[PDB]
Structure 1
Amino acid sequence: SMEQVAMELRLTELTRLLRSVLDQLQDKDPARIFAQPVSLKEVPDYLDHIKHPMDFATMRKRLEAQGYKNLHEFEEDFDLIIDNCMKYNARDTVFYRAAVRLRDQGGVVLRQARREVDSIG
C-alpha cells in the first residue's frame, strides 16, 4: 500500500536524522572509550554487573537496519552507554569522567534533535 510506503519513508528520514545525531554524539568521545562493546574476554565479570551492555558500534548496527522507530528508543540506548559506565567504573576514573562529559555534551545535541523530530514530524 501507499500508506505503508509513506510510513517507510518517515522511518528512513528518522534514520537519516539519527545518523547525524549519532555522529555528533560520538564526536564528544574523542578518546573512543564508547566506540566498541566491552570485551567479555578482557572484563570477564562484566555481564554479572551490567545487564544490557551498549556501545556506539552496536547502536550503528541497529540504526543501519532502521531499527530505531522513534527518538526515545535511540536515547534509551545512548543512556545505557553512559549509565552502564557510571555504574561499573568509580567516580575517580577516566572512564566515569568520560561518561559524565559525554552525557553533558550530548544533552545539547539531543535537545535540538527532539525539536527537529517534533517539528518535521
Structure 2
Amino acid sequence: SMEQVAMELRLTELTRLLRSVLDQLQDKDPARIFAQPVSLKEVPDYLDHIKHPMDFATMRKRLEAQGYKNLHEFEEDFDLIIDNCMKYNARDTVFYRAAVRLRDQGGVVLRQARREVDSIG
C-alpha cells in the first residue's frame, strides 16, 4: 500500500533524527566508557548484577535495523546505559562519574529531540 510506504518514510526519517541524536550523545563520552558492551570475558559475573546490559554499539545496531519505534524506546536504552553503570560501579569511580556527566550533558540533547519529534510529527 501507499500508506505503509508513507509510514516507512517517517520511520526512516525518525531513524535519521535518532542517528543524529545518538551521535550527539556519544560525543558526550569522549573516553568511550559506554561505546561497547561490558566484556563478559573480563567481568564474568556482570549478568548476576545487571539484567539488561546496554551500550552505544548495541543501540546503533538496533537503530540501523529501524528497531526504534519512537523516541521513548530510544531514551529507555540510553537510560539503561547510565543506570546500569551507576549501580555496578561505586560513587567514587571514573565509571560512575562518567555516567553522571553523560546523563547531565545528554539532557539538553534529549530535551530538544523531544520538541523536534513532536514538531515534525
**TM-score normalised according to structure 2 size:** 1.00
Aligned-residue offset at 1:111: 0.1
Summarize deviations over 1:7-35 as a string: whole Å, max 9, x none: 10010000000000000000000000000
Counting matched residue pairs gives: 121
Kindly state the Cα deviation for residue 79 of structure 1 after the two structures are TM-superposed: 0.2
Residues 18-62 of structure 1: CA deviation (Å, up to 9, x unaligned)? 000000000000000000000000000000000000000000000
What CA distance in whole angstroms lies between the structure 1 residues aligned with 2:40 and 2:47? 8
Indicate the percent of aligned positions where both proteins have the same amino acid: 100
| Ranges of 4+ aligned residues in structure 1 off by more than 3 Å | none
Secondary structure of residue in 1 paired with 2:66? coil
The two structures, once aligned, show a CA RMSD in angstroms of: 0.2
Query: Can you give the 5+ residue segments of structure 2 that lack an aligned partner in the other structure?
Result: none
- Structure 1: where are the runs of 5+ without partners? none
Please name the residue that 1:64 is paired with. Answer: 64
Distance in 2, matches of 1:16 and 1:4, equals 18
